[PDB]
Amino acid sequence: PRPTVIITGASSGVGLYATKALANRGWHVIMACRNLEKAEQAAKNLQIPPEAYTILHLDLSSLASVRGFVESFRALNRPLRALVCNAAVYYPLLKEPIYSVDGYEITVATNHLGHFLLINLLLEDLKNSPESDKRLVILGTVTANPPDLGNLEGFEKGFKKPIAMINGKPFKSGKAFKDSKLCNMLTARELHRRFHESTGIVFNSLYPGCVADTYVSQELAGERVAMVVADPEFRQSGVHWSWGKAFVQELSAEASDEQKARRLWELSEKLVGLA
Ligand SMILES: NC(=O)c1ccc[n+]([C@@H]2O[C@H](COP(=O)([O-])OP(=O)(O)OC[C@H]3O[C@@H](n4cnc5c(N)ncnc54)[C@H](OP(=O)(O)O)[C@@H]3O)[C@@H](O)[C@H]2O)c1
Ligand SMILES: [Cl-]
Ligand SMILES: [Cl-]
Ligand SMILES: [Cl-]
Ligand SMILES: [Cl-]
Ligand SMILES: [Zn+2]
Ligand SMILES: [Zn+2]
Ligand SMILES: [Zn+2]
Ligand SMILES: [Zn+2]
Ligand SMILES: [Zn+2]
C-alpha cells in the first residue's frame, strides 16, 4: 500500500530531488514530465526503484496535454494523496513573445494557466480520494509579502496575440516569469479560500531557497519540498513556507490583493475553458 504524489517538472532540479526524497519516504511518485527520454534517464541515474515511480507525459504549455495527462493518471486507478506544482519555465533571452499551442504567452501559459487547469481537474480526484492527509503544494515566490498584474487588463481582453502580459502592457520576459510566479501564489491563496472547507485538502505553498539556475543545493530544496508534502509539522492549509527552519506566513497576508486574487481565478477559468 503506497501513497501517490504527482510532481510536475520531475525530471530535473528541485523536482527530481523531491521525487527521490518522497520515494525514500515510501511514496509512489508520478513524474509528470515534458521530456520522456530525460525523465527515464534521470529516474535510473538516481537509482530509484521501479515501484516508487511512474513517468507520465505532461506538457503544461498545452491544455490538451493537461487534459490528456489527467485521463492517464485516472487510468492507473491509484488514489491521489498529493500534487506538487513545481514546473517552471523562463526564457530570459526573448525580446518577442512566443504563444503556446492554445494562443497564450508561453511563460504565463505554462507556469500558471496549465497548472491552473491541472489543479482544477485533479481537485475532483483529490476530493474523491479516501487518503486522510491530502495536500496540494505550489512552488511560489520568496514571501507572501517587480511583478505587477495591473487590473488584469490582458486577461480581461482574452490574453491572445497581440496581448503578451497579464496587465496588457508590452512583453518583458523576465517580468512575465515574475508575473507567472505571483499567479501561482494568488492561486494557492485562492484554493485555500474556495476549497479547504468543502474538501479538507491542505492547500499551501513554499519557497525552498535560492538555487543554482542560469545559496542552496537542489538536493536540499528537494528535501524541503518532501517535508512540506509529507511531514506532520507542515500540515496546515492557507500558508506559505519560506527558507529565504522555515518562516511561515498566511497566503492571504496581503489584504489589498483580495479582489485581484478572485478576479485572476475567474479569468483563468475562462482562459482554460472551465467557464
Ligand atoms: N532561482 C531562484 O531564485 C528562484 C526564484 C523564484 C522561484 N524559484 C523556484 O524554484 C524552482 C526550481 O525548479 P526546478 O529546479 O525543478 O527547475 P529546473 O530544473 O531549473 O528546470 C525547469 C523544470 O520545468 C520542467 N518543465 C519545463 N517546461 C515544461 C512544460 N512545458 N511542461 C512540463 N514540465 C516542464 C522541466 O522538466 P521536464 O521538461 O522534463 O518536465 C524542469 O524540471 C521553480 O519551481 C521556481 O518556481 C526559484
Ligand atoms: Cl501521453
Ligand atoms: Cl500528453
Ligand atoms: Cl478545518
Ligand atoms: Cl477542460
Ligand atoms: Zn505524451
Ligand atoms: Zn497557478
Ligand atoms: Zn468546519
Ligand atoms: Zn483546516
Ligand atoms: Zn477573505
Atom of ligand 1 nearest to the CA of 62: 31
- Report in angstroms the alpha-carbon separations of 100 from 65, 111, 254, 267: 12, 12, 31, 18
d(CA 18, CA 114): 21
Cis peptide before 208 (omega within 30 of 0): no
Which residues surround ligand 1 with Cβ inside 6 Å? Answer: 8-9, 11-15, 33-35, 38-39, 58-61, 86-89, 110, 139, 181, 210-211, 213
- Cell 492554445 sits on residue: 102
d(CA 262, CA 66): 23
- DSSP-based three-state secondary structure for 125: helix
Atom of ligand 1 nearest to the CA of 39: 40
Give resolution, Å, one decimal: 2.5
d(CA 19, CA 64): 25
Taking the CA atoms of 155, 272, 190 and 91 in sequence, report the sign of the dihedral they define: negative
Method: X-ray
Ligand 7 (single-atom ion) residues, CB below 5 Å = 112, 115-116, 184, 187
Phi and psi at residue 22, to the nearest 5°: -65, -35
Q: Which residues contact 202 (CB under 8 A, 6 or more apart)?
A: 133, 134, 135, 136, 196, 235, 236, 237
- CATH architecture of the region 4-272: 3-Layer(aba) Sandwich (3.40)
Separation of 196 CA from ligand 4 center, angstroms?
7
- Report in angstroms the alpha-carbon separations of 246 from 156, 206, 233, 240, 265: 37, 9, 11, 9, 28
All three cell numbers of 30:
508520478
Domain assignments of the chain as residue spans, ordered by start: 4-272
Atom of ligand 1 nearest to the CA of 88: 24
Q: Which ligand is nearest to the CA of 66?
A: 3
Q: Ligand 1: which residue has its CA nearest to atom 17? A: 13
Among residues 37, 47, 39, 53, the alpha carbon closest in space to that of 9 is found at 39
